[PDB]
């Protein structure tokens, strides 16, 4: 409830500069005994009372998953990869791989999913004949 | 009715800095306790008590899927890529491919259809004979 403890919640999706505003405004939402600060490493750091923390560090973890873009890398079945590249690229990262023949992505979950709809778009290889 | 929570609705399809007079203006609409902010990632937070936010996260939703424009790529049946690339391009993204023959689109769902109308105009492979 009342209890004043300092605790640090990373948004490492985002430079977490973006909240100063608004958990600095937490501080300024009631009584105070905050701090709000910021680390070059991106870590950011609370003091406070155990409610005003409680949705302070709810934004914290927030405006983390909720900047959330993240890494992963896919196989390419038939079609090579220097084509599937050559479509993704200029629509509008995208990387390709022949060795192993991988389509490479970043993004959210979302970016994610949208871009798996692109491969299941093609995955298919050409009955070229 | 009266109750204040904090609900929060991305507008993906644009940045959501366009509905900032409109939805501080929607807490300047009535007695206030709101909250309207933004993540770089594009998320748009509220605050509000049941109402002022109905009628504002009605306004985010709304501002997302009348901000559509979104993903599509479409078969191409006989008529070589490049071509009806050549012509669509310089009529004012479109993308060709050769290897499965595919004509590629983006836009909102009206861009889905007024291309697909373009698409109807020629799927036809011509007599050449």
Do not use: W
Request: aromatic share 2%; no cysteine; net charge negative.
């Amino acid at each position: 409830g009342d209890e004043l403890v300092t605790r640090i919640v990373p948004l490492e999706n985002v430079p977490a500069r973006d909240l100063a505003p608004l958990l600095r405004q937490m501080m300024d939402a009631g009584s105070v005994g905050n701090v709000v600060h910021y680390e070059p490493s991106n870590v950011l750091i609370l003091t406070g009372r155990a409610s005003t923390i409680n949705k302070l560090i709810e934004v914290i973890k927030r405006v983390d998953v909720i900047g959330t873009e993240k890494q992963q890398i896919i196989h390419l079945e038939y079609a090579s990869a220097e084509d599937l590249a050559e479509i993704l690229n200029q629509l509008i990262k995208i990387v390709a791989d022949k060795r192993t023949n991988s389509l490479i992505i970043s993004g959210p979950e979302k970016a994610r999913q949208r871009i798996t709809s692109l491969l299941k778009s093609l995955d298919v290889e050409e009955s070229e004949e």
